[PDB]
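Postdoc handover notes: sequence design on the structure in folder B. Input tokens:
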């Protein structure tokens, strides 16, 4: 009955509800272009659901030795993020009709973010934890650079409802993604300052907002209709 359980339970509920709602809504859409966004965006909280549920049940948790202590690390988060973060970038890329090469590069930079963040979460040499964290944060900053300079630029050729929706999602994304590396740095994977219960509450708010909040905004806009 670990104290962070409550936040995993509430994350499981919120992700489950969001998945359902988005499914119900997506089932009623016939527009070809809109259906693709629904599929992708319903899949995202679905995957987060399974991983929050897993973590609630005590899977995806391992102890890593570093700084003279056994430290609890939820690796299940990375299995979620490995698929969900590129799917959220895909939403944004299809919105602004980004080029296939840009999408490859993003997904590739995202895989590297997640994978190097994983390696760092599992690293036993304390200082090497932060080498992997820095490389991960670099890859995240490449992504955000691309969203902000590349996509915004592209979105500016599009219809106003597309440009407006993109900007909102881009802003939500940059604010919430940028908070992840900070939480990791001060939390249990990092400096150990913020306790695991509070850290789990923080990832909860950020994940729900970055998937369900993002989703509500995207799927209720007129921008997804071709
Ligand atoms: C839906 C879940 C989302 C949108 C999660 C996004 C997560 C990140 C942007 C995490 C980034 C990380 C780094 C910048 C550095 C090292 C650790 C990570 C994986 C937490
Ligand atoms: C289930 C994921 C479906 C997303 C399709 C996106 C295709 C890109 C344009 C052809
Ligand atoms: C244009 C296609 C790029 C191929 C993958 C490169 C990923 C490197 C991270 C910048
Ligand atoms: C450490 C910060 C890394 C920033 C990457 C620069 C983006 C590439 C522009 C083409
Ligand atoms: C050129 C170095 C890139 C690092 C900055 C990332 C900017 C994020 C845009 C919101
Ligand atoms: C255009 C403004 C979009 C909203 C971004 C604010 C995110 C706040 C996170 C708590
Ligand atoms: C302790 C040495 C840091 C290694 C640099 C990481 C990029 C290759
Ligand atoms: C969004 C990540 C910013 C770069 C590291 C910030 C650590 C305070």
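Designed sequence:
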């Amino acid at each position: 009955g670990r104290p962070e359980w409550i936040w995993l339970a509430l994350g499981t509920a919120l992700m489950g509800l969001g998945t359902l709602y988005f499914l119900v809504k997506g089932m009623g859409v016939s527009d070809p272009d809109a259906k693709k966004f629904y599929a992708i965006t319903t899949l995202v909280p679905a995957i987060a659901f399974t991983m929050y549920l897993s973590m609630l049940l005590g899977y995806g948790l391992t102890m890593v030795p570093f700084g003279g202590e056994q430290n609890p690390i939820y690796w299940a988060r990375y299995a979620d993020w490995l698929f969900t973060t590129p799917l959220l970038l895909l939403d944004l890329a299809l919105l602004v009709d980004a080029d296939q090469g840009t999408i490859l590069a993003l997904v590739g930079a995202d895989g590297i973010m997640i994978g190097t963040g994983l390696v760092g979460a599992l690293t036993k040499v304390y200082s090497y934890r932060f080498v992997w964290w820095a490389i991960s944060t670099a890859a995240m900053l490449y992504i955000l650079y691309v969203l902000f300079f590349g996509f915004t630029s592209k979105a500016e050729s599009m219809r106003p409802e597309v440009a407006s929706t993109f900007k909102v999602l881009r802003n939500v994304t940059v604010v919430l993604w940028s908070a992840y590396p900070v939480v990791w740095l001060i939390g249990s994977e990092g400096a150990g300052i913020v306790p695991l219960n509070i850290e789990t509450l923080l990832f909860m708010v950020l994940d729900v907002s970055a998937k369900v909040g993002f989703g509500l905004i995207l799927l209720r806009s007129r921008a997804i209709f071709g």
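Context for whoever picks this up: Residues 86 and 107 are 5 Å apart (CA to CA). Don't rerun without checking with the PI first.
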